[PDB]
Structures are given as C-alpha cells and as structure tokens.
Design a protein around this ligand. Structure first.
Ligand SMILES: [Cl-]
Ligand SMILES: [Cl-]
Ligand SMILES: [Cl-]
Ligand SMILES: [Cl-]
Ligand SMILES: [Cl-]
Ligand SMILES: [Cl-]
Ligand code: NA
Ligand code: NA
Lengths: 93, 416
C-alpha cells in the first residue's frame, strides 16, 4: 500500500540481534521461538500468534498488536514500551 | 394495559395496543430470522424505526406518570472514539422536551426534560474491565418508571440501580413520534439489539417488573450465554460458573481418557477499552437432536452432546456402572459409544436453574447433572445425582451450572 509488510509466514526456532522498524506483520506465527536482544519498533502486528516463546533483552516499542494471541510466552510489562493492544488474547506464562 | 406494544407479527412490526399506532421502518433494519422480534439497528440513517403515536396518548402533562420497558443487547465497545460519546438510541424529544434513552461507554442513560430548560438523568453504569460481565453483549431487561411527585427510576433485570428527583419539573411536552435510531454516534461500526418495547400509562411497581422480567425471559427455551435461544448443530465454548477461571479440555479421547476443567483461562484486552476473561476457550460442544422430527433447544429435550477435539467431532459419554458416586465423563468416537450413557435431558427450569444437562442411561434412569469433581487434583467432568438433589428447593450456583458461548460480533475476540 505504502508501508512495509510481511505476511503468511511461520518462523520456527530462533531470532537474534535484529532491530526491526516500520513493519506490518500480517498473520505471522512465532512458535517455539527464542528472541535474544531483538527489537521491534514502530510496527504493527495483525492476526499473528506467539506460542511457547522466550525473550531475553527484547522489546516491542511503539507497536500496535491487533487480533494476536500470546500463548505460553515469557512476556512481561517492561518489554512492551509505549504500547497498545486491540482484541489481543493472553494465554498463560 | 400497554399504550404501546411493539411486537413482530406475520411479516411486520406492529403495535399490539388498541391505539395501533403506525410504525415506519427503514430499508436497513435487520430482524433475527430465528426470533424476528429481535431487532438490529445500525449506525445508518436507514436503520431506524419510527413510531407515530396517536395524539391522545401523547405525553403533554406535568403530573401524569409513565414507564417504558425493553430488552437490549449492547455489544462491547471496541474503539476509543466511543469513550465519552453519548449517543441517543430512542427519542421522544420535541423542542428539548420529552424523554430519551441514550447510551455511552459503559452506560445506559435516561433523560426527561420540560419546556423550561430543566432536565434530570438516571444512569445505569457497567464495567468492561471485568472478568465475566452480566451486561456486556448480553440481553438485559431495562425498565424505567417515572413519578412526577418524586423520582425517575432505572431498573436492570428487575432490580433498582438508581433513582433521581423529578418533582422540580415541569410540564413535559414529548414528541408526537418515537425514533429508534442511533443519533450522535461517532463509532462507524456500532449497533444495538432491541426487543419487546413497551410503554405504560403509570409508574410500575417493583413486582410488576419482576413479573415482566420472568415472562419475557421465555422460561421453557434454553438460552446461550448472550441470551438468544440455544440451538442444535451449533458450536458453543463452555463456561462453568462455579469455577469460571477454568476451561474444558480432553487429555485423551476414548473411555481411556477424560474431559476436565483446565486453568487458567486467559484474558482478552484492548488498551483503555476493556480487559476481560477469554470466552473462546477449549473443546467446543455441539448439541445434537436425539429425535430428528426447528433447531431451538427446549426444556426436557433429550439430546446427545458432541465434542470437538483437534478439529474432530466426538461424543460425550460415560459408563454409570463404574464404581463410585460420580460417574466420570469421556469423549468417545461416535460409532463406538456402544451402550454407554450419552443421552442428556436439557434443563431450562423446574424454578429456573443454570444446571442445564441431566445425564441418563438408555433405560430412563438419571445418571446425573453434568458438572465436575476433583480427583488427584484434576477437576474431571462427572455426572452425579447429588446435583439433582441440591436442586430441590434451592437455586444456588453449582458445578453443574454451565453457560454456552458461541462466537459473536459484539464480543469480538479471536476464535481459538
Ligand atoms: Cl457491571
Ligand atoms: Cl450494577
Ligand atoms: Cl470500563
Ligand atoms: Cl436457560
Ligand atoms: Cl443469559
Ligand atoms: Cl472412542
Ligand atoms: Na460488566
Ligand atoms: Na444460541
């Protein structure tokens, strides 16, 4: 449209050392993933799924999450900064 | 009694009062094809019903008492433009005099006003930062009564919420017509559900309202969580009122395994709008007809219960000849139930009770109401006749008290 966008994708194991900014992730799966010092800034997450995930020094800054599930995640308040959720389901850590 | 009685009959909405006032429906008013008396109004100029009253019963007095009754299903607010955006849904205001039902984030509001610039508001407030609401996206019975010598009263489900003084007023001259329409609503995807709209030429007392609550509740037809008729061949997520921070699961299919209550059921959350418990959780049930001979589930209807595991349809069953007081339930493959007990009598009342499924064998004997029990710290679904026994002369909440939740646009959670 006029924004960067990466959809219908399933990331299976590990993400390390990347600062992702300005992205829309449409229906992306993060399943069994380990995040290590990864940073998403100024991005949008739509109809995505977080499942059985681990996060070390990773952060979601100025991110809107829409229609996404966090299921068995290690996510804490201090990880999402100046944050926003919209119809997001939270299943337990 | 009624001077207005908006009811759907044949293929048209009408007034069942002698005054038989004329109703002007718009092109874009939706009727529930299962209960057409359930009316759906959109934020569109064409989504509007207008009642042109007979000039006699038009309110133009300073001492005549009146009341209005209706049921409403108000979907959850999803967006921030709807915080502090009061919007009128029913209007009998002519030159800022008359009355109106208005809505706003977490509120249903009533306003009267006279010809001389004085009003009064009564307000029922409800939260959306709450695990399980009685009021979000569920049919609630609203009744508003007025007495000119004292107060206006707002009752929800037969029970008084608030009362505010109106003795200071004031001759009120209301509109000659009532407009059912969302006016002033800044949320483009917004609607209400409305049904059973009544007007009365007096201030109803607190027993007349309970009675109207009990008759219009359609005791004799089971309901889902939201208040609509319970249906066959329709997936429902399950909510146990006794233990509501748990959802239903199956460890394994077959008489080998068991259905159980798993926790903790999570949350749904929109920032500054709502934080609720998740409702779309665990194994879905489907109520199957025993007698294939209308898909409305009624009191004492013998059924089966299907169960969805990993996308596949199974059967709720048990052996009641197993030793012990509670008979533990399993999800069986369907062509393999044999002569295990699976036939369930569905219960609306006795008298109303939230305990909905009474398990029987194939020779007419009660196995018990489906509920749950703790074994080795595993809350397994069981049937037991203790349930059927505590239901004598009590109406409290038990582990057999259930709620069926289908997916709905008013709730707006991601199904999974
Ligand atoms: Cl409430
Ligand atoms: Cl309340
Ligand atoms: Cl709220
Ligand atoms: Cl019911
Ligand atoms: Cl209900
Ligand atoms: Cl089986
Ligand atoms: Na509520
Ligand atoms: Na239903």
């Amino acid at each position: 449209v006029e924004r960067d966008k990466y959809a219908n994708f399933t990331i299976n194991f590990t993400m390390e050392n990347q600062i992702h900014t300005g992205m829309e992730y449409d229906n992306g799966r993060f399943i069994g993933v380990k995040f290590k010092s990864v940073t998403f800034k100024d991005s949008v997450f739509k109809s995505c799924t977080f499942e059985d995930v681990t996060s070390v020094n990773t952060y979601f800054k100025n991110c809107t999450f829409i229609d996404t599930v966090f299921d068995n995640t290690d996510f804490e308040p201090y990880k999402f900064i100046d944050s926003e959720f919209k119809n997001c389901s939270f299943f337990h850590n | 009694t009624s001077i207005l009685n908006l009811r759907y009959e044949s293929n048209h909405l009408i007034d069942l009062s002698r005054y038989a006032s004329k109703i002007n429906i718009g092109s874009k008013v939706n009727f529930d094809p299962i209960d057409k008396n359930q009316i759906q109004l959109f934020n569109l100029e064409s989504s509007k019903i207008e009642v042109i009253l007979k000039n006699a019963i038009v309110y133009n007095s300073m001492y005549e008492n009146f009341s209005t009754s209706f049921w409403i299903r108000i979907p959850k607010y999803f967006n921030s433009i709807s915080l502090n955006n009061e919007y009128t849904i029913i209007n009998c205001m002519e030159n800022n005099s008359g009355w109106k039902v208005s809505l706003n984030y977490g509120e249903i509001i009533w306003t009267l006003q006279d010809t001389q610039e004085i009003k009064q508001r009564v307000v029922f407030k409800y939260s959306q930062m709450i695990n399980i609401s009685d009021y979000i996206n569920r049919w609630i019975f609203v009744t508003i009564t007025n007495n000119r010598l004292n107060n206006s009263k707002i009752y929800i489900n037969g029970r008084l919420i608030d009362q505010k003084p109106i003795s200071n007023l004031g001759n009120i001259h209301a509109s000659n017509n009532i407009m059912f329409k969302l006016d002033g609503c800044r949320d483009t995807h917004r609607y209400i559900w409305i049904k059973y709209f009544n007007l009365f030429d007096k201030e109803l007392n607190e027993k007349e309202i309970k009675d109207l609550y009990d008759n219009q509740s359609n005791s004799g037809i089971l309901k889902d969580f939201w208040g609509d008729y319970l249906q066959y061949d329709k997936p429902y997520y399950m909510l146990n009122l006794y233990d509501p921070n748990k959802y239903v699961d199956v460890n394994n299919v077959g008489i080998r395994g068991y259905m159980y209550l798993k926790g903790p059921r999570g949350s749904v959350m929109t920032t500054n709008i709502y934080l609720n418990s998740s409702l779309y959780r665990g194994t879905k049930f489907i109520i199957k007809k025993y007698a294939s001979g209308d898909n409305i589930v009624r009191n004492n209807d013998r059924v089966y219960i299907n169960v969805v595991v990993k996308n596949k349809e199974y059967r709720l069953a048990t052996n009641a000849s197993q030793a012990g007081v509670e008979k533990i339930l399993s999800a069986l493959e369907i062509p393999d139930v044999g002569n295990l007990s699976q036939v369930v009598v569905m219960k609306s009342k006795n008298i109303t009770n939230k305990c909905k499924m009474n398990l029987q064998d194939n020779n007419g004997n009660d196995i018990g109401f489906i509920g749950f029990h703790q074994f080795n710290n595993i809350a397994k679904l069981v049937a037991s006749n203790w349930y059927n026994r505590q239901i004598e002369r009590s109406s409290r909440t038990l582990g057999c008290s259930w709620e069926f939740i289908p997916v709905d646009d008013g709730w707006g959670e991601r199904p999974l």
